[PDB]
Structures are given as structure tokens and as C-alpha cells.
Antibody, heavy 226, light 214 residues
Framework: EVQLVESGGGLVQPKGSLKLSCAAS????????MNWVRQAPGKGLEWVAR??????????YYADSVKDRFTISRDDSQSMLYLQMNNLKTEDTAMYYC??????????????????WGQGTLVTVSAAKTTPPSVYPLAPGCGDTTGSSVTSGCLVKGYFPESVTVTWNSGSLSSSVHTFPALLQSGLYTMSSSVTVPSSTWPSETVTCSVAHPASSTTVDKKLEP | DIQMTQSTSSLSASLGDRVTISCRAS??????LNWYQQKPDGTVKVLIY???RLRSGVPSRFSGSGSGTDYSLTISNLEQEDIATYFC?????????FGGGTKLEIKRADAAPTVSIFPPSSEQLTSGGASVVCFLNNFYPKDINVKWKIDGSERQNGVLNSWTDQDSKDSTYSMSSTLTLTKDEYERHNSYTCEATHKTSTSPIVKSFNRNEC
């Protein structure tokens, strides 16, 4: 099935530049038009740009908001889509999605629509500098118990930009995990993550959070202890 | 440009309900109107295109109607997995524009939160900071109040609260409350309590620890 995997997202200063990539697979890339669509945090979707297939001479179209600043391009041999973004502005801060256009208009209608979407790559345009998080374990204090369950966590404090990923036991404990959306407070983000397990299996068996903050090349593990 | 308006930005429905989401275009778009679902985790998929055509693989409970400037997405017999934000989009003329989104909550039976409290870590204390954290997990409805009591007095400065998305499996919410103090402020007191007030109980659900016992 169709895979569209975006990369290249990160922190950039106002007036700076950034290039996004999207690696396509599972369909004949060279027969489809491709798009970028974006989503500012907590906001709706905005179409950014389109590039047609080789058969239509790679015609390109842009939203007025990005026209002359952004360049959409493709490398058919590598099944890659690109977005070169120049003279970036604060209001370009968004999740950027790689999107495959609808197919043959004789079957799917002339009107434009967006058949497949990647998971997105986040672009943050900000004057603020990259700051890695402090990671701290959240362990119950001694001398209290409910026989059935215990809840543990990791506190991820004072980082910029978004985002971070917390995994529990290298992804092994998925079902029981809550992620608390980050909050911005005086220029820096904080979030937390919780996991709940059988009261038997911990502390007898080990529980570890792994916190990734790609923007600052940080990966921190906190093994939780009584 | 063609402006797309979804005049309802959020709604709450029960399992099995009919959900109708409307979209109005600023001018005729000749039925080139499509609908998307964005799950809480950000995943987007197309549901309906060309007003009423169902995308292969999308369940038949999704249908679309309309003409001219006025369009509707209907979800018949709403299911648990339909928690999402729904967007319309015109494909008639560039730039292709989207509606503002309609967020759909699904109701469920009222549920009391499970409360957990956590003292500051050694690591943070050493650095000179003290963050006390309370989790209220798996409750419904979303509205909830958390108070921090320090040696019995309410503390509001340094508190930050964060609600999860509605849980896609069981329709509950969770929230974190974080009280951040200086190390010196932390050591000044002994009793740290988070109290949850929620429509599911006439008295608060409470968790506490004592600093000098931890």
C-alpha cells in the first residue's frame, strides 16, 4: 500500500530556509500529481503547492501565501517529492504533509482532491534557540499501595522546539500509555507521559522511558526505581 | 478565493447517532467538494469525493450530499472509531481551500478519575527545582477541577494543567497537573495533596504524600 514519508522538518529562524523531503512508495510515483498541504498548530488545513506529472511537463502551482518563496520539485527516479522553503515567516509554522493527488479524472472527477497523506513533518519558525529537555522519573513515594495497578511516568521539562517522543520499554508497553500534550510556558515546552501496569510486574520487572528530542539530538532513558 | 465555512466547529454525539456536518462555499463549486477525517493522532484520510462518492475502503456509514454552495457529511450509526476532526475541501478552483474543521467528541458513561501523585525526583531536587505532578486518568466528562493543597493551603502559582485527547478506545479523558516550585520552597512544607473535583462524586478524590516520609 501507499507510503509517503516526510522528513527535513525542524527549527529555522525567520527569513531562513529549509528543504522538506517525502519518500514515496507502493504506487507508480511518476504517473501522479503531488502536493504539499500544511496545518498550523491547532488550526485547519491549507493547500501549499502542486506539481504535475512528467506527462503534463511538471506544471507547478502555489498558494499566494507561499508563492515566490517556496519551490516544489520532484525526482521521479528516486520517487521523491521536495519543498524548498525560503524567506520563512512565523506564520509558516506548521505540520507539513506530503499528499498524492487523485488519479485519472475520467474516473475520479475533474475536481482536485487528495488521495493519500503522509504523517507529516513539523516546521517551527521561531527566534528562540533549541533547548533539550530535562527528563525526570515519576515514581510513587514509599508506603502506599493498591494491589491491582501502579501508574508510573516521565516528566519532560523545558525544551524547545516541539516535538518529543516518549516510549516505554522500547515500545513494548503501548496499550496502557497516556501522553499529555505539551504546554508552552515562557518560551519552553513541558509535557509528561504515563504508563500503567500490573502491580505484580513492577518493581520486579524493569520499566524505562526513552525520551527523544530530535531537534537537540537528545535521547535520554530514565529507569524507574522505588 | 473561495471561502469554505463549517459553521459548527465542535460537536458531541453518542454511539449510534446520526451526525451531520455542514459546509458552505462562498460561491458555486460545481459539486467538487470532498471530505477528510483527521484522527486525534494527526492521521488524515479522504472519506468522500465529488460530493457523494465514497472512497474505496471507507465504511458505508459515511455519506455526502449537496449542490451549489451547500454540502453535508453524514455519519450514520456513529461508531467508537469515528472520534476525529472532519474537514471539507473544494477542488473546483485554485487555490484549493478547506473548511475550518468540525471536531467530533463521542459521549460515554460518566467515569471518575484515577488519581496518582508523584514527588519531585532526586535529579531535579539536586538541580534546585521541585515539580510535583498529579495524574487524573480515564475520566468523563472532560470538565474537571484540580487543586493543590500544600500543608492544607491551596496553591495556584506554578500550576499547569494538560488534558489528553479523548481516548479512541473508551472515550475517556486524562489530565496532568504540574506544580513547579524552587527546591527551597519545596523543603519548606510537608503535606502535598492534589484533590480532583468532578461531577462523578460529591466529595473530591484525593492523593497525598508527606515530604519527610519520602
Amino acid at each position: 500500500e501507499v507510503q509517503l514519508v516526510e522528513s527535513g522538518g525542524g527549527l529555522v529562524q525567520p527569513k531562513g530556509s529549509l528543504k522538506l523531503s517525502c519518500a514515496a512508495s507502493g504506487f507508480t510515483f511518476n504517473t501522479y500529481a503531488m502536493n504539499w498541504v500544511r496545518q498550523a498548530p491547532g488550526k485547519g488545513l491549507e493547500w501549499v503547492a502542486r506539481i504535475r506529472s512528467k506527462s503534463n511537463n511538471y506544471a507547478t502551482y502555489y498558494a499566494d501565501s507561499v508563492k515566490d518563496r517556496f519551490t516544489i520539485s520532484r525526482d521521479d527516479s528516486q520517487s521523491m517529492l521536495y519543498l524548498q522553503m525560503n524567506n520563512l515567516k512565523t506564520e509558516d509554522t506548521a505540520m507539513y504533509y506530503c499528499v498524492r493527488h487523485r488519479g485519472a479524472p475520467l474516473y475520479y472527477g475533474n475536481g482536485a482532491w487528495f488521495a493519500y497523506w503522509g504523517q507529516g513533518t513539523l516546521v517551527t519558525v521561531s527566534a528562540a534557540k533549541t533547548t533539550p529537555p530535562s527528563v525526570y522519573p515519576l515514581a510513587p513515594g514509599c508506603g502506599d499501595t493498591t494491589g491491582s495497578s501502579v501508574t508510573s511516568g516521565c516528566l519532560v521539562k523545558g525544551y524547545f522546539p516541539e516535538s518529543v517522543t516518549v516510549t516505554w520499554n522500547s515500545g513494548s508497553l503501548s496499550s496502557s500509555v497516556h501522553t499529555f500534550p505539551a504546554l508552552l510556558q515562557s518560551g519552553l515546552y513541558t509535557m509528561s507521559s504515563s504508563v500503567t501496569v500490573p502491580s505484580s510486574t513492577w518493581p520486579s520487572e524493569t520499566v524505562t522511558c526513552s525520551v527523544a528530542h530530535p531537534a537537540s539530538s537528545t535521547t535520554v532513558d530514565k529507569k524507574l526505581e522505588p | 478565493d473561495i471561502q469554505m465555512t463549517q459553521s459548527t466547529s465542535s460537536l458531541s454525539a453518542s454511539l449510534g447517532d446520526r451526525v451531520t456536518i455542514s459546509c458552505r462555499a462562498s460561491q458555486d463549486i460545481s459539486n467538487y467538494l470532498n471530505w477528510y477525517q483527521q484522527k486525534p493522532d494527526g492521521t488524515v484520510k479522504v472519506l468522500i469525493y465529488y460530493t457523494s462518492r465514497l472512497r474505496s475502503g471507507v465504511p458505508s456509514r459515511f455519506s455526502g450530499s449537496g449542490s451549489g454552495t451547500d454540502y453535508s457529511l453524514t455519519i450514520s450509526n456513529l461508531e467508537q472509531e469515528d472520534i476525529a476532526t472532519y474537514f471539507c475541501q473544494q477542488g473546483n478552483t485554485l487555490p484549493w481551500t478547506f473548511g475550518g474543521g468540525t471536531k467530533l467528541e463521542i459521549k460515554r458513561a460518566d467515569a471518575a478519575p484515577t488519581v496518582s501523585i508523584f514527588p519531585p525526583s532526586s535529579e531535579q531536587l539536586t538541580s534546585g527545582g521541585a515539580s510535583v505532578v498529579c495524574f487524573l486518568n480515564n475520566f468523563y466528562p472532560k470538565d474537571i477541577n484540580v487543586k493543590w493543597k500544600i500543608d492544607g493551603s491551596e496553591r495556584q502559582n506554578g500550576v499547569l494543567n494538560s488534558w489528553t485527547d479523548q481516548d479512541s478506545k473508551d472515550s475517556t479523558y486524562s489530565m496532568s497537573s504540574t506544580l513547579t516550585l524552587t527546591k527551597d520552597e519545596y523543603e519548606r512544607h510537608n503535606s502535598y495533596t492534589c484533590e480532583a473535583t468532578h461531577k462523578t462524586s460529591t466529595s473530591p478524590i484525593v492523593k497525598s504524600f508527606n515530604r519527610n516520609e519520602c
